[PDB]
Design a protein around this ligand. Sequence first.
Ligand SMILES: OC[C@H]1O[C@H](O[C@H]2O[C@H](CO)[C@@H](O)[C@H](O)[C@H]2O)[C@H](O)[C@@H](O)[C@@H]1O
Length: 406
Amino acid sequence: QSGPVIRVAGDSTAVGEGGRWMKEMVEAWGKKTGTRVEYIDSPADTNDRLALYQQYWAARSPDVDVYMIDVIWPGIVAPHALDLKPYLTEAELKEFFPRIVQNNTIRGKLTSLPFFTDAGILYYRKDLLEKYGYTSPPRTWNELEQMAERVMEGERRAGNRDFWGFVFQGKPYEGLTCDALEWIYSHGGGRIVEPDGTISVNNGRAALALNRAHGWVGRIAPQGVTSYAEEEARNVWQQGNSLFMRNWPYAYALGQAEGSPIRGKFGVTVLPKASADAPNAATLGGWQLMVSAYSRYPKEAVDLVKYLASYEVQKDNAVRLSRLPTRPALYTDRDVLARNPWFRDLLPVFQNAVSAPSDVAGARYNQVSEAIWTEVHSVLTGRKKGEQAVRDLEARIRRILRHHHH
Ligand SMILES: OC[C@H]1O[C@H](O[C@H]2O[C@H](CO)[C@@H](O)[C@H](O)[C@H]2O)[C@H](O)[C@@H](O)[C@@H]1O
């Protein structure tokens, strides 16, 4: 047909159904409104997407109108965002969780609408826990290790060469920062960089957390876990070859799909922690919808963003893709809850999720994060002990944030 073509970059066809579903939603809006649309695909890992989208932004490119942006990005991407505040009433904006709207608001600019939230959780094979005499998923990291060693011994003995105790995201990329924040915080080691700016990571609890994680590699987790992102972990788990997995909510719907080897065989719960008085750790993730400051079609782009962020599209995301709404009203919707009962069970885990240090690092967050995941990876690979790594990380972050004030 004719008129503007509204072009969207967001999510990836390389991560679950997200890219496919996103294209479907954008096509549905185009059909509803009689507007031409195009979907531009992205790489799997968030930090690779940031670099791709930065090419467009540095160019002031009009070739993408709407970007799906990570929770950790507002402080970096704000100059490239159209301020959405004038386009939403106060009532419309209050329909989203205020913490996420606050996150997305930089120096008063509403950079982006909340789309879906995210929190790290523990996936567990309930069939296998029952087989090996366990009644509850593990609450402590020591329990997780003990269960993993026992179930692995038994499943290996029964003939499954492919079977592991635990998979997670050990690749050097942003997902490892997420995993590592959960390890450190759940050992009482802090937030790596505190909201006040204190770089706190050089402490014995953070070091222990990293040594613990090294101890999994090649033992209860595959040697190759040091190259796993979300999907590599998910594919071991989904084939039936891991007792436990750390991952985000999206993996639940995919594991329940017809033809999944593990359909009906798993539950989810909060990640374990070092001891009963440590805090629960679930890293806060999630994605927002930004209209490009370079879009030639801001009114149409805003209309698309409000549609994607609407109740019925977020509902579809919850029901079909098990991704977490940013609208509190959806957590009381009968159909969302009947499909995903665990959304009610773990709502307090999602509410108490711990943010990575993107607010305090602001536009330097991707540099801080790269330091984190590289130093953590050096522990996972055995290159360094946790004590040295947290000392080296402290020094790196001090250099990166020197002269930065939030
Ligand atoms: O909901 C699943 C999403 O997984 C990825 O995003 C999560 O993990 C990132 C780290 O790898 C975090 O930075 C992000 O905040 C999390 O939401 C993936 O990039 C998304 O496309 C998936 O929808």
